Structures are given as C-alpha cells and as structure tokens.
Write a protein that binds this ligand. Structure first.
Ligand SMILES: *[C@@H]1O[C@H](CO)[C@@H](O[C@@H]2O[C@H](CO)[C@@H](O[C@@H]3O[C@H](CO[C@H]4O[C@H](CO)[C@@H](O)[C@H](O)[C@@H]4O)[C@@H](O)[C@H](O[C@H]4O[C@H](CO)[C@@H](O)[C@H](O)[C@@H]4O[C@H]4O[C@H](CO)[C@@H](O)[C@H](O)[C@@H]4O[C@H]4O[C@H](CO)[C@@H](O)[C@H](O)[C@@H]4O)[C@@H]3O)[C@H](O)[C@H]2NC(C)=O)[C@H](O)[C@H]1NC(C)=O
Ligand SMILES: CCCCC/C=C/C/C=C/CCCCCCCC(=O)O[C@H](COC(=O)CCCCCCCCCCCCCCC)COP(=O)([O-])OCC[N+](C)(C)C
Ligand SMILES: CCCCC/C=C/C/C=C\CCCCCCCC(=O)O[C@H](COC(=O)CCCCCCCCCCCCCCC)COP(=O)([O-])OCC[N+](C)(C)C
Ligand SMILES: CCCCC/C=C\C/C=C\CCCCCCCC(=O)O[C@H](COC(=O)CCCCCCCCCCCCCCC)COP(=O)([O-])OCC[N+](C)(C)C
Ligand SMILES: CCCCC/C=C\C/C=C\CCCCCCCC(=O)O[C@H](COC(=O)CCCCCCCCCCCCCCC)COP(=O)([O-])OCC[N+](C)(C)C
Ligand SMILES: *[C@@H]1O[C@H](CO)[C@@H](O[C@@H]2O[C@H](CO)[C@@H](O[C@@H]3O[C@H](CO)[C@@H](O)[C@H](O)[C@@H]3O)[C@H](O)[C@H]2NC(C)=O)[C@H](O)[C@H]1NC(C)=O
Ligand SMILES: *[C@@H]1O[C@H](CO)[C@@H](O[C@@H]2O[C@H](CO)[C@@H](O)[C@H](O)[C@H]2NC(C)=O)[C@H](O)[C@H]1NC(C)=O
Ligand SMILES: *[C@@H]1O[C@H](CO)[C@@H](O)[C@H](O)[C@H]1NC(C)=O
Ligand SMILES: [Mn+2]
Lengths: 34, 149, 41, 85, 433, 255, 196, 112
C-alpha cells in the first residue's frame, strides 16, 4: 500500500495546489471585474 | 413450555407488554421400577426481573401415563419491558429438587401497535377537522386558478 | 470546563486574529445577513 | 474423465495477459485525461443556444466516446488500486 | 449385508501409525482364492463408527505403483477393490491397503497442567475383523514413545513399536474383542471445524486471489486450574523450544511466488504475521489451549499464468488446475467448501475432482463492478480432509469468448452513457413558471 | 501565511488527531483490549453477562458481543451505582450483588505493569463516590484512605482497601511476577509484596492479557454441599493446621 | 425504529427507539444500499461507516462555499471552503473512523444556514421550506439542533429591534417555523418538547 | 418457613386513559361539517370564486393535468394514512410527480 510519509506529502501537495488555485482565481476575478 | 393464549409460539411472535401468555410444565415421579404422574398441590411459577413480578400456584390441568401436567391460567404479562425470567423451582424437603428457567425479552409497544385515530371517540374531531381543511384547500386552489381578477 | 488560550491557536492558525477583524468589517456594511453572522460569532 | 482432462491441461500454451498489469496504471492516467477532456466539451455543448438537433447530435457523439474511454479507465484504475475485476 | 466368502487370507499385517493428529492404517495382505469361480472383486470391512470418518482409502499391488480401483460403498460397512485381471480359482495375490481416519485418541486425564505431557486413549479392534477367514495375522502400533494397554493377547514393546500378534487362524467377522491403549503425544492436535476457501480468477488483471477462513480449535487436554498468564510467561522464560500441546504459531504453506499476504481476525487485523520463502507464519491473538476456539482469515495473491492454461483446440477455451488445500502442516478439516469464482462471462464446460465430493453447485455472485450478472461461482463440498494426504488439483474447463472479455468496459460505459443522457434530458427541459 | 496555515494544519492533524484507540502505541504495539475482547467472544457462552465499569461497555458489547450491565450512555445512575458498589465491597457482598443480577464474568483494567494510568484502580474513588450517595452506611470513602488521609496501595494501606474486590482482583499474582516478591507499581509507584494481596475465594481467573492490562474473572458456582465458599477456601488452603479438638459448635435451635 | 436490545443494561433493557437519533444510521444504510444496487460496488458496511466523515467533509466544504457566496462573493466562498476543508478544529471530530453524530450534523448545520439565508434575503417560500426540511434532518441526527432553533429566531428578533422588518422576513420565518416545528415533533426522542 | 409455600403476587396495571362519551364527540364533528359547508357556500355565493375564465382550448388538457396532480397527491396521502407503507408512498409520489411537475409547470406557463 502507500506509506505514511507519502500520504503526508500527498496531503500537503493537495493543500498547496488548492490554495494556489484559489489565489489565482481571486486575482483574476479582482483584476478583471469592477 | 410457555406460549401465547392462542398457541402462537414465542419465535413466531415475540412477547410485548400486556400480552396474554400461558405456561405449562410436567412432573413425573420414579418409585423403583417405572415412572408415574406426580400429584402435588404446592408448586409455584415465578416471572421475575430481579424481583418476582408474578408468583402463581400451578394447578392440575391434564394428565398422562408417566407425567402429570400443571399450568397457570392465561395471565397478562406486566406493563414493564425488559429481560424477564420464567422459572419453576420445586424444592420440597424430602424429594428431589428441580429448576426450570427461561430468560425471555418482553418488548415495548411498537409505533404500529396503538389504537388508530378512528378507534378513539376523542380523536374523531381532529381527524374531521384535518379532512375538512384538506378539502377546503383542494377547492380553494381550483377556485383560485379558475377565476380571474 | 473552560479552555485556555493556546488551544484557540492550536485549532485555528492565522485565522484567530482575522476572525475579529472580519466581524468588524462585517459590522461596517451591516446588511441583513451580516447580523446573523455577527450574532453567530 | 479426470485423466483425459489432466492430460489436456498439459498443453504447452499458457495464459498471456492482454495488457500487462505493470503498465495498467499508466494507461489509466492517460485514459483519465481523455475521459476528462472530451466529456467536459459535451457538457459545455449543452447551453450553446443553437438548435436542439445540433446540441443533441453533438452531445450523443461526444458521450459515446467519453463513456467508452471512461469504462476502460475505470477498469484499469480498479485493477491498479488492488481491487481486481 | 454379507459378501461372498470367496477369499482366504494367508497373511494380515496391520500397522497403525499414531504419530500425527490422524490415524494412518496400512494393511499388507497376500489374499488367496477358494471358491471355484474367476473373481475380480474384494471386500474390506470397516466398523460403523470409523467408517463414518474415513479421509482416504487407497489400494495397490505390492509389485509396482498400480493403484487398483477402490471405492467405499454408498452393521459393519465395506469398501470394494476391483481387479483388472480376474484371478483364477486358485491364485495368490498380494496387496497394500492404506487408509486414513479423522479419529484420534481422547485426552486420558482430560485435565493437564500447562507443562505436563499429555496421554491419549484410543480403542479399536485387536483381532483382524475382515470378511474372510485368515490363516496368519499380526498387528503393530508405531508413532509414540510410550505405549501402555488399558485393562489387559498381550504386546511386547520393540523400541517405539508395540507389536502383538494373534498369529493362529481366526474366524471371519471376529468383532468381539476391543483393544484400548494409551500413548503419549506432545503435539497441538488442532482441528478445523470449518473451512471456506475462495479462489477468484481475473483475466483483466491476470491474477488469482486466494482467501481462506478457518474456524480452528485445539482438542488436546484441557487446562486444569484455569489459565495463568504468569505460568505461561515463566515457561516462555525458561522452556526453550520445548514441545507443547497448545498452539503458539501456525505455518501456512502457500504456492510459489505469493504476494500481498494478509492475516485478519473478526476484530480487525492481526499484526503478528511474517511471510518468508513460500511460508507464512501467523501468531493468533491468544495461545490456543485445549478446548479453545479461534476463527480467522488469511489471504494472498498469485499470478494467473501458472494456474490457467489455454486450450490449443480453440483460443477461447481455458482449463484450470486449482489446489484443494494450502494450510498448516498437520491439521484436520471436518468441512471444506471450495468456491471458484470465474469472470462475468464464463460458461463452465467440464469439471473433475480427484477425491469424492459431497455436493457440487453452480451459481452466480456479484462483486465489484459486476452489473449484468455476478461472477460464476462453482462450489465443491468436502467432509473429511487431511492436510498432507488430501493432495490433488481440481480441474475446470470453461469457455470465455473475447466478446465476453470486452463486455465489462462496455457495461460500465453503458451505465455512464445512460447517466449522461439522463443528465442531458433533465437539463434541456423547461420547468419554469 | 496561507501556505504556513496549510503546513500547520497538516502537522496538527498528523500529530494530535490521528491516534488509534483500540491499539496503544520501546514504542511497541499494545493490543490487549482486542485480545481480551476476542477471547471473551470466542471462549465464552453466547448468553454470558460481563460486569465492568461503564467506560468500556460500548467496546465490550461491540467487539466482544456479550451482554453487559452498564454502557457509556449512563441513563440509570442507580445501575451504575450497583455496579460500582460490587467492586468496592468484601468478596462475599460482591458475590451476592453480582450473582443476584445473573452476572457471569467480571472484567477489570490494570495498568500497573506498563504504566497505563487509565486503569481501574485510578478511577476507584469514583466507584466509591457514586456508590456512597445511595448506601452511605455501607461503603464509606474515608475508610479507603490511610489513618493520615493518603490513598495508599502499599503495605500501609487500610484493611478496607486491602479487602475490597477490585484490589485483590487486580493485584493478584502481581508480586510473584518479579523475583524476590518486590513488585513495583508503575502508575502509583509503590512496592507490593506477596502478603499484601489476600486470596480470592469466590472468583476464578479465566484470562489475563499479555501485558496484564485486562483481567477476566468468573463467578464460581455455589458449593454443592451448601457451605460458604470462604470455608471451602480456608479448608483447602490452611489444611496443614486444623483444630483437631472436638468442641460443641454452639449453634442455634434447628427450626 | 422498533428495536429493543437485551444485550445492554441487562435486567432493565434499553428501548433504543426513544433514546437514539436515527439520522446517521439511516444515511449510512441508504448509501450502503445505493452503492450495493445502483453502482455495482458491494462495499462492506464497516467501510461505509469508517469513511463517512471524510466523504461528508467535502459536502461541508461545498455547504460553506454556498453559504459564503451569499454573504459576500464567490471568491470569499472559495476561500472559506478551502479553509474549512483542512482546519484542525473540524478534523478533530471528522477524522476517518469517527462515526458519530457530529460528522453528519456539522454539515447539515451549514446546509440549513445556507437555505435560511437564501430565504431571509429573498423571501421565497420554497427556500424556507428547504431550510425547514434540512432543519428536521438535523433534529433527527444530532442533539445540538437546539442551536438552530435558538439562533434563527434571535436573528429575526434582532432585525425587528433594528427596524428592518419586511414582508420577506414574515414569509421566510413563518414558513420555516410552521414547517420545521411540526416536522421536528415526529422524532420519537424529541416529542412534545418544542411546545413545553 | 424459609422453605415452604409462599403467598401469591399479581401485577397491578394502571387504568388506561378515558375516552369522551360518543354522543358528545359527534356533535363537534357535525359542527365542523356545517362549518366547512358554510365556508364553501360563502365562497360560492358572495360573488367571489365565481367559476368564470375557465380555459377551454389546448390548455384545458393541461389544466386537468394540474388538477390531477394536486388531487392525486392528496389521494396518496390518504392511502398512506390508511396503512400503506412509507416506501410505497415515496415511489407513488415519484411516479406521480415526474409527469405532474411538467404538466403543472406548463399549465402555469400557458396561463398568464
Ligand atoms: C434503575 O436501576 C435501578 C437498579 O436496578 C432500579 O431500581 C429498582 O427498582 C425496582 C422497581 O422499580 C425496585 O423494586 C421495588 O422496590 C420497592 C421498595 O421496597 C423496599 O422496601 C421494602 C419494604 O417496604 C423492602 O422489603 C424491599 O427489599 C426494598 O428495600 C418494593 O416495594 C417493590 O416491591 C413490589 O414489587 C415487587 C416486584 O414488582 C413485588 O415482588 C413486591 O411484592 C411488591 O409488589 C407490590 O407492588 C406491585 C406493584 O408495584 C404489585 O403488583 C404487587 O402485587 C404488590 O402489591 C402490593 O403492594 C402495593 C403497594 O406497593 C399495594 O398497592 C397492593 O395492593 C399490594 O398490597 C419492588 O421490589 C428495586 O428495589 C430498585 N432497586 C434499587 C437498588 O433501587 C430502577 O427501577 C431502574 N430505573 C428504571 C428502570 O427506570
Ligand atoms: C466521482 C468519483 C470518481 C472516483 C474518485 C475516487 C476514487 C479514488 C480512490 C482511491 C483509492 C480507492 C481504493 C482503495 C484501495 C483498495 C480498497 C479495498 O481493498 O477495499 C475493497 C473495497 O473496494 C472497493 O469497493 C473500491 C472500489 C475501487 C475504486 C476504483 C476507482 C474507480 C471508481 C469509479 C466509479 C465509477 C462508477 C461507474 C458506475 C458503474 C474491499 O475488498 P475486499 O475486502 O472484498 O477484498 C477483495 C478480495 N476478494 C475479492 C478476494 C474478496
Ligand atoms: C455519485 C457518485 C458517482 C461516482 C461513484 C463513485 C463512488 C466512489 C467509488 C469508489 C471510491 C472508493 C470507495 C471506498 C473504497 C475504500 C474501502 C476501504 O475502506 O478500504 C480500506 C483502505 O482504506 C483506504 O485506502 C481509504 C482511502 C480510499 C477511500 C477514500 C477515497 C473515496 C472516499 C469517498 C467514497 C467513500 C464511499 C464509501 C463511504 C461512504 C481497506 O478496507 P479493509 O479493511 O476491508 O481491507 C481490504 C483489503 N484486505 C482485506 C485485503 C486487507
Ligand atoms: C470529487 C472528486 C474527488 C477527488 C479526490 C478524492 C479522493 C482522492 C483523495 C485521496 C486518495 C487517497 C489515496 C489512497 C490510495 C491507497 C491505495 C494505494 O496505495 O494504491 C497504490 C497504487 O496506486 C496507484 O498506482 C494507482 C495509479 C492510478 C492513478 C489513479 C487513476 C484515476 C482514478 C480516479 C478516477 C476513477 C474513474 C475515472 C473515470 C470515471 C498501491 O497499490 P497496492 O500495492 O496497495 O495494491 C495493488 C497491487 N498491485 C500493485 C499489484 C497492483
Ligand atoms: C410535493 C410532495 C411532497 C411530499 C412530502 C415529502 C416529504 C415530507 C418532508 C418531511 C417529512 C417529515 C415526517 C417524517 C416521517 C417519516 C416516515 C417514517 O419514518 O415512517 C413511519 C415510521 O414511524 C416513525 O417511527 C417516525 C420516526 C421518524 C424517524 C425517521 C428517520 C429520520 C430520517 C432523516 C432523513 C433520512 C434520509 C436518508 C437519505 C438522505 C411510518 O412508516 P410505516 O411503514 O410503518 O407506515 C405507517 C402508516 N401509518 C402511519 C398510517 C400507520
Ligand atoms: C467460531 O467458530 C466456531 C466453530 O464452529 C463457532 O462455534 C459454533 O458456535 C455455534 C453458536 O455460537 C454453536 O451452535 C450451538 O450449537 C449447540 C448444539 O451443540 C446449540 O445448543 C446452541 O444453541 C448453538 O446453536 C456451534 O455448536 C459451535 N461449534 C462448535 C464446533 O463448537 C463459533 O460460533 C464461531 N464464532 C464466531 C464469532 O464466528
Ligand atoms: C447441493 O446444493 C446445495 C448446497 O448448498 C443444497 O441445495 C440447495 O440448498 C439451499 C440452501 O443453502 C436451498 O435454498 C436450495 O433450495 C437447495 N436447492 C437448490 C436447487 O439450490 C443441497 O445441499 C444440495 N442440493 C441437492 C442435493 O439437491
Ligand atoms: C389420566 O386419568 C387418570 C388419572 O387419575 C389415569 O387413568 C391416568 O393417569 C390417565 N389416563 C389416561 C387414559 O390418560
Ligand atoms: Mn457522541
């Protein structure tokens, strides 16, 4: 199966990707919409 | 053996509170060569949780070739649910001692087993009112759509 | 059983201080939903 | 008969898997992307505001491919995750 | 019943090896013919009790490895041996009749301490109880370090053997005498009351998954004065590699190249398991003492390439040889249910089992991603199987056309396509007011 | 700050809120609860009743699958009090109270061998306090403390603590574990000797886990000749020295 | 619903029917049955109960997004969903294996507050009815439903003191109350308490 | 006397709650019946709810469907009140609301 340090890396990667997509979305929406 | 008033065994229909039940046992006496019916008049059956809820003297009711059969009447189980014990303890000084105990579970009334609304003369009013309101709503929707302002 | 202060930081990081600030900003516009939010808070 | 079968069972031909299990993960991933691409286009087709006929003839033809890929992708992903089909 | 008395035994060498947890009996005979008719069959007499529990019955000529046809019938019972060359009115032919009985002797004191050695009491017949008049006969016990008759036609020990011979002629059906003997045993004496094997074959992943569920119990001498954890730890502390009659570790022997082992219980999994070199050591949660139960599960996976061969007649016709047992080295099974699960599209074509079964069934049972109809499930039932003696491979020929191979992704895609069409319908419908 | 929050969150959930409950993790795994519950499940009668503190009722009933007496959803305090008064009274009163409720086994938790800390002896005082509000004239909480006011499990302990049921049912055979009889508790940090623990005359020990964490005893059936189990015990135990003189037993009138 | 187990509180017994919130077990059984019949996956029931909280934490995330898209904007809803997805204060009680009332409840709380805010700021009767339905779904899952029944009135009450009464308020609140209060008395456990 | 005959014991049940005499509960049912009749007469004869503006074109085949939906739901509930299971009620509601929703949203769209 998958070990623990791998699931930790996976959780952290999911979180980072989520928070980066959220920041990009907010920037796009705030710059291109009054 | 114990069962419903009408013979329906326990496994067929588990017990509940205030359900008529009957209990029966048989006693035989050995006298050296063969068994015969044992005739006694002081035997007691007890239905108890931790304390005796029912204590009834068994009365002779039927016979046979080798045993004598005793039975309580058609007593009504109590109105308290729980895991009860039907026990017959025959301990007469001089004779052999005999214990027969069965641990059953007396259930509570299910949401289905309650006198319906039409069976209670006190609730004819409320059901009549519900029906009246539903029929007035049904006529109001129709008369609200059909007619124009 | 009251809780001490470190637990509030333990359970929410960087979001404990922003919570009062957001209640304030939500108390500057004061729309109808914001009253529900403030009461909850 | 048991002996006739036991002798039949010793035929030099042995089972050879269609797609090796070691390379089933990869396929899955690949399939996944396609399953996500084409399918998504179909969903966007709805709401085009074109004729009903065009939006149906396009939705069905895009789903008859999204499905066909998604079935294989599901089989491969199940096999790769340890739950064999 | 009484069979024809057309055979006169001139020798009867009956040996009984009590070494393991089952009785292994061997009868060497040099039968001769009396009645003047060419005959081709021979009867062997078993009692009622022991006949109820017989796990293996083989016969063969002493000259070579020719296994003569031998079948148990279907109030002493009989087994029948059939010859291929009917013997002449006067002929002498030697034979070896091997049998395995699930019975074993009962603990004699019944209650014995954690460290005392245990004795077993086993009672059988002494004089040869056969369906014919024998001229010579013997009897020998082997497999225990100490033999002792119970309430004594007496035996003279020879090392670890206990030979007593009623050599002189004996009238047939001599069943009056019973012989009870106590021997010493120092093995766990474990028995599986129920086994539920399950072999799942998969063509897509090309794998065969085995999963077994064992209801085990040690039927050795019970533990007197309850179970004391302190006494156990003390024994572990000093008694290094000392033979015992409780189960500490089991050694499952799996097929070559197994992978993804797992050992589970009915309360989660167990972490005391170790798989090395086609071997799997499993330690139960608690040491199974005499009279204790333990129900558990074992599982593993193998390559389907070395269990499924493709018929050269038609490219879409498969044969499978699947083992009957894979478990502890010296165990006894009172019930086996071997289920084989073939893919959603198979069609059984032929079936063969090396040992007789009690019931064979074919059904379907749905599993993960089985939409139309479940896997084909073929179940064999067995009654008295012994670990090392019940060797054999069930053979199953079946069909699996490419059109059934590709029907699984097609079914999944049909489900997804119907879902999409329904979403489209409900998304292109005006429900506004 | 957002990325730091992600990292902090992952760390906190991996370190503080991801610890199992049935297995207890130098740094080895302790699976005594599942071991004892499974023993109960497989080597006991299917209609047996288990009597234990109310904290474990849901696992004793969910993993062992046996009838219990008290659960975690304490809805009848008087039943939890009956069950607490039977783990604090002399062995005879405990036998009576338990048998009257048809109890079959008794399960105690002992963490004095590996420093568990949440064992039964630690929550004993609550068993005393809950069973004191209903029978204030039988179980007195000030009788388990020493003459000074200390809760001691040592030799200096009160005779009431020494004679209670939980004490002699948890510390049975513990002194004779370590050679010399100098067994040292690890939760209370006190030395126990073989004399501190009186024998059990009414209960048999049927199971003790590998780390002595869970102990399961069984009520023995009343004597056939109808005498007190304590007299049976004293007869088998102190047999080498008996009163060989004949003296009128000074009984009362036979009815 | 008419269960009576004799394997607990041995002599007395437990009726269970009137001392249990049948909202989590019902959802678990429904998901189990659906996976078993409509999807072809005969997943075990222990895996449907161990992975219940993780599966419903993304439903709590979407509920938070929808609730925050009504207060400010979609971007704030995305931010709030991202926050509540992994915040430890929720993970403590939503970890895999924690098969308790809270896992489901704290999702239904947000699903109910999103409909109460849609109804309170739109005046719709349909959204007030959805709010009442999910409120009933919550009284039957968690004993902390007493939060909603005391926080939705307060809101309205406050809006009355601030002089912000409007027909939308009347419509929303009277629909929510009328429906939810009569539907919350049908749960055997909570019966006749709302009036007394 | 510890061993010997013992006195009997019979449980004591409570008296079930009393139900009002029947002739006192039929009068109120009659009052409610007369009240509903009077309501229907008040609508029918106060110049309100007069049955005009009845659709008769193609939209009439939709108006009947609208009525069919409403009355059919009240029939399902009736059946349920009389003993029908809850799952059968859910399935009946599904089957009757699938086309009823369409027919009753089309009626409202056609009726301005
Ligand atoms: C939570 O758990 C706890 C612990 O498990 C539960 O607590 C137990 O509850 C029991 C009942 O709820 C209770 O049992 C009753 O105790 C009463 C108190 O008696 C005490 O005082 C007397 C002296 O007066 C002592 O002798 C006795 O030992 C006690 O110390 C008893 O009075 C009750 O006896 C009656 O019931 C039993 C069994 O039902 C009969 O055997 C007995 O003969 C009594 O029966 C009379 O009453 C019943 C109806 O109640 C009649 O059916 C019957 O025919 C008898 O009727 C006569 O008397 C009545 C007046 O009582 C009269 O009107 C009639 O005409 C007749 O003359 C009974 O023994 C336990 O003591 C109690 N235990 C503890 C430790 O607290 C608690 O219930 C649980 N809570 C739940 C489940 O919600
Ligand atoms: C929109 C959703 C899209 C998908 C997103 C989520 C999926 C990713 C999941 C990641 C890992 C999951 C697998 C866990 C690891 C093994 C679990 C296990 O081993 O447990 C299994 C349970 O198996 C499952 O049911 C898992 C299902 C497999 C998941 C594959 C993903 C595809 C899903 C797409 C669904 C499309 C539906 C189409 C409609 C028909 C228990 O096996 P067993 O005890 O029977 O032993 C088996 C041994 N015999 C057979 C011998 C007894
Ligand atoms: C509207 C939906 C449309 C799409 C439909 C698709 C739905 C999802 C389908 C498949 C996804 C996986 C479903 C559960 C499979 C893991 C079972 C398990 O628990 O496996 C656990 C392993 O833990 C895991 O890896 C957990 C990670 C994987 C699950 C998380 C991803 C999906 C979560 C959302 C779905 C949850 C649905 C059930 C709960 C409500 C082992 O189980 P075991 O102890 O029996 O060992 C079985 C193997 N031995 C016996 C051989 C040892
Ligand atoms: C709404 C959408 C939500 C999306 C997110 C939801 C869930 C994901 C979050 C967390 C997942 C937890 C991961 C647990 C994994 C434990 C099992 C494990 O460890 O598997 C790993 C293997 O992995 C893999 O290489 C799998 C690679 C395949 C990539 C995934 C394919 C896409 C599936 C998703 C879409 C499915 C349907 C598509 C069309 C509808 C170990 O396998 P093994 O050695 O145990 O057995 C296998 C035995 N052999 C090795 C012999 C085979
Ligand atoms: C546009 C048309 C809309 C139609 C209305 C639609 C929905 C109504 C909205 C709310 C209804 C509130 C009243 C609840 C009554 C339930 C019926 C019932 O629980 O069954 C009851 C069982 O009694 C009970 O214990 C009620 C206890 C309530 C427990 C319910 C568990 C909570 C579940 C929460 C949601 C779970 C969803 C899972 C999947 C997401 C009767 O069942 P029976 O088979 O015995 O029949 C009996 C026929 N007698 C009545 C005439 C005899
Ligand atoms: C683990 O496997 C053992 C081995 O089969 C199971 O033992 C069996 O348990 C059942 C019920 O617990 C016994 O049935 C009983 O039969 C007696 C007649 O002897 C009857 O009077 C009882 O009312 C009951 O029906 C069965 O005899 C017993 N088998 C043996 C060989 O002892 C055990 O149940 C399994 N445990 C689990 C948790 O799966
Ligand atoms: C052989 O097949 C099965 C073995 O389980 C048995 O027959 C069926 O047994 C099931 C009970 O598991 C019944 O529900 C079925 O009605 C039985 N018959 C069929 C046709 O399925 C039985 O042991 C054997 N059946 C025989 C000899 O006919
Ligand atoms: C029942 O009747 C009497 C009992 O006094 C006696 O004949 C015998 O016990 C029984 N007779 C029959 C025919 O059952
Ligand atoms: Mn809880």
């Amino acid at each position: 199966m998958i070990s623990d340090e791998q699931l930790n890396s996976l959780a952290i990667t999911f979180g980072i990707v989520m928070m980066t997509l959220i920041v990009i979305y907010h920037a796009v929406d705030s710059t291109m919409s009054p | 053996v114990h069962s419903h008033a009408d013979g329906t065994s326990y496994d067929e229909e588990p017990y509940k509170i205030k359900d008529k039940v009957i209990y029966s046992v048989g006693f035989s006496e050995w006298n050296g060569e063969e068994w015969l019916p044992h005739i006694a008049d002081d035997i007691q059956f007890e239905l108890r949780q931790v304390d005796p809820y029912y204590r009834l003297t068994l009365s002779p009711s039927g016979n046979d070739s080798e045993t004598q059969y005793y039975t309580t009447g058609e007593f009504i189980l109590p109105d308290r649910h729980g895991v009860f014990t039907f026990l017959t303890d025959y301990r007469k000084i001089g004779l052999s001692f005999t214990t027969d105990k069965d641990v059953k579970a007396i259930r509570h009334l299910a949401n289905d087993e309650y006198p319906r609304s039409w069976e209670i003369s006190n609730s004819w009013v409320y059901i009549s009112a519900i029906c009246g309101v539903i029929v007035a709503w049904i006529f109001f929707v129709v008369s609200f759509v059909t007619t124009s302002s | 059983q009251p809780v001490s202060w470190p637990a509030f930081f333990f359970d929410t990081h960087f979001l404990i201080w922003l919570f009062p600030a957001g209640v304030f900003l939500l108390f500057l516009d004061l729309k109808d939903e914001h009253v529900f939010v403030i009461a909850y808070s | 008969t048991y002996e006739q079968l036991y002798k039949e069972f010793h035929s030099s031909k042995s089972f050879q898997p269609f797609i090796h299990l070691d390379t089933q993960p990869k396929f899955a991933i690949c399939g996944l992307i396609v399953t996500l691409a084409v399918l998504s286009s179909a969903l966007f087709a709805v709401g085009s505001k074109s004729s009903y006929i065009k939006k149906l003839f396009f939705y069905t033809i895009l789903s008859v491919i999204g499905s066909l890929f998604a079935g294989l992708t599901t089989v491969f992903a199940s096999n790769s995750f340890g739950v064999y089909v | 019943y009484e069979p024809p008395a057309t055979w006169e035994n001139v020798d009867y060498k009956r040996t009984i090896d009590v070494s393991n947890a089952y009785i292994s009996e061997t009868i060497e005979i040099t039968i001769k013919n009396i009645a003047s008719e060419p005959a081709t069959e021979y009867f062997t007499a078993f009692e009622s009790g022991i006949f109820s529990k017989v796990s293996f019955f083989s016969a063969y000529f002493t000259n070579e490895a020719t296994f003569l046809n031998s079948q148990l019938l279907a109030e002493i019972r009989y087994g029948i041996i059939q010859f291929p060359n009917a013997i002449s009115p006067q002929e002498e032919v030697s034979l070896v009749i091997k049998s395995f009985y699930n019975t074993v002797g009962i603990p004699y004191p019944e209650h014995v301490g954690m460290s005392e050695e245990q004795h077993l009491l086993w009672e059988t017949n002494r004089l040869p109880l056969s369906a014919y008049d024998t001229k010579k006969a013997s009897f020998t016990l082997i497999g225990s370090s100490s033999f002792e008759e119970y309430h004594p036609l007496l035996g003279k020990a020879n090392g670890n053997s206990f030979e007593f011979g009623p050599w002189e002629d004996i009238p047939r059906f001599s069943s009056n005498e019973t012989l009870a003997i106590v021997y010493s045993h120092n093995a766990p004496l474990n028995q599986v009351v129920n086994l539920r094997r399950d072999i799942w074959l998969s063509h897509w992943a090309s794998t065969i998954q085995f999963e077994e569920y064992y209801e085990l119990t040690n039927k050795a001498a019970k533990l007197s004065k309850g179970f004391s954890r302190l006494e156990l730890m003390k024994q572990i502390q000093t008694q290094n590699m000392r033979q015992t009659h409780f189960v500490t570790v089991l050694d499952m022997l799996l097929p070559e190249g197994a992978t993804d082992h797992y050992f589970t219980d009915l309360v989660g999994l167990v972490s005391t398991s170790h798989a090395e070199r086609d071997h799997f050591f499993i330690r139960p949660r608690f040491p199974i003492f005499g009279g204790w139960n333990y129900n558990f599960t074992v599982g593993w996976t193998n390559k389907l390439s070395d269990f499924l061969h493709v018929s050269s007649g038609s490219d879409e016709k498969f044969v499978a040889s699947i083992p009957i047992l894979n478990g502890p080295p010296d165990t006894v099974y009172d019930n086996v249910e071997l289920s084989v699960f073939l893919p959603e599209g198979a069609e059984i074509f032929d079936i063969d089992s090396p040992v007789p079964f009690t019931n064979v069934s074919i059904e379907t049972q749905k599993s993960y991603f089985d939409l139309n109809k479940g896997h084909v499930k073929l179940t064999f039932s067995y009654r008295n199987l012994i670990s090392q003696v019940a060797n054999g491979q069930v053979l199953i020929k079946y069909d699996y056309p490419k059109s059934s191979f590709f029907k699984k992704p097609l079914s999944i895609a049909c489900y997804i396509f119907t879902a999409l069409m329904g979403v489209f319908v409900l998304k292109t419908l005006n429900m506004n007011v | 700050y957002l990325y730091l929050f992600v990292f902090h969150s992952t760390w906190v959930t991996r370190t503080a809120y991801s610890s199992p409950s049935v297995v207890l993790p130098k740094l080895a795994l302790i699976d005594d609860f599942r071991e004892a519950y499974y023993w109960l499940r497989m080597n006991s009668d299917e209609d047996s009743k288990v009597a234990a503190w109310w904290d474990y009722g849901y696992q004793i009933g969910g993993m062992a699958d046996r009838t219990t007496l008290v659960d975690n959803n304490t809805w009848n305090n008087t039943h939890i009090a009956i069950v607490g008064k039977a783990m604090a009274s002399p062995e005879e009163k405990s036998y009576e109270i338990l048998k009257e409720h048809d109890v079959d086994y008794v399960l105690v938790i002992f963490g004095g061998l590996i420093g568990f800390g949440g064992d039964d002896i630690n929550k004993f005082l609550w068993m005393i306090r809950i069973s004191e509000g209903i029978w204030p004239e039988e179980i007195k909480e000030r009788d388990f403390y020493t003459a000074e006011g200390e809760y001691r499990v040592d030799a200096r302990a009160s005779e009431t603590m020494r004679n209670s049921l939980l004490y002699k049912m948890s510390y049975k055979d513990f002194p004779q574990l370590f050679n010399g009889g100098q067994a040292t508790d690890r939760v209370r940090q006190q030395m126990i000797t073989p004399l501190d623990v009186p024998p059990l005359d009414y209960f048999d020990e049927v199971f003790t886990s590998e780390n002595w964490m869970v102990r399961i005893y069984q009520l023995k059936k009343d004597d056939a000749q109808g005498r007190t189990l304590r007299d049976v015990g004293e007869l088998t135990r102190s047999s080498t020295k008996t009163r060989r003189s004949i003296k009128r037993p000074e009984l009362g009138l036979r009815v | 619903l008419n269960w009576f187990d004799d394997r607990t509180w041995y002599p007395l017994g437990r009726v269970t029917g009137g001392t249990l919130y049948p909202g989590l077990m019902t959802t678990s059984a429904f998901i189990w049955h659906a996976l078993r019949n409509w999807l072809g996956l005969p997943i075990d029931i222990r895996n449907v109960c161990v992975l219940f909280a993780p599966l419903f934490s993304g439903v709590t995330a979407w509920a938070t997004y929808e609730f925050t898209k009504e207060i400010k904007d979609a971007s704030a809803g995305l931010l709030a969903a991202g926050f509540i997805a992994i915040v430890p204060g929720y993970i403590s009680r939503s970890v895999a294996g924690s098969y308790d009332n809270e896992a489901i409840a704290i999702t239904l709380l947000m699903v109910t507050f999103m409909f109460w805010i849609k109804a309170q700021k739109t005046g719709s009767i349909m959204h007030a009815t959805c709010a009442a339905l999910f409120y009933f779904y919550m009284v039957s899952a968690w004993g902390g439903y007493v939060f909603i029944t005391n926080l939705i009135p307060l809101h309205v009450f406050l809006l009355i003191l601030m002089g912000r009464y409007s027909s939308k308020l009347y419509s929303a609140y009277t629909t929510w109350y009328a429906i939810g209060t009569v539907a919350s008395m049908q749960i055997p456990f909570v019966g006749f308490l709302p009036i007394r | 006397d510890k061993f010997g005959i013992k006195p009997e014991i019979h449980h004591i049940f409570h008296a079930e709650p009393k139900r009002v005499a029947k002739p006192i509960a039929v009068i109120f049912v009659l009052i409610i019946f007369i009240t509903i009749l009077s309501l229907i007469v008040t609508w029918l004869n106060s110049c309100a709810a007069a049955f005009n503006n009845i659709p008769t074109g193609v939209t009439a085949v939709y108006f009947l469907g609208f009525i069919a939906t409403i009355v059919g739901f009240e029939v399902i509930f009736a059946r349920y009140y009389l003993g029908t299971s809850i799952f059968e009620t859910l399935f009946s509601s599904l089957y009757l609301g699938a086309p009823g929703l369409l027919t009753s949203t089309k009626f409202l769209r056609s009726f301005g």
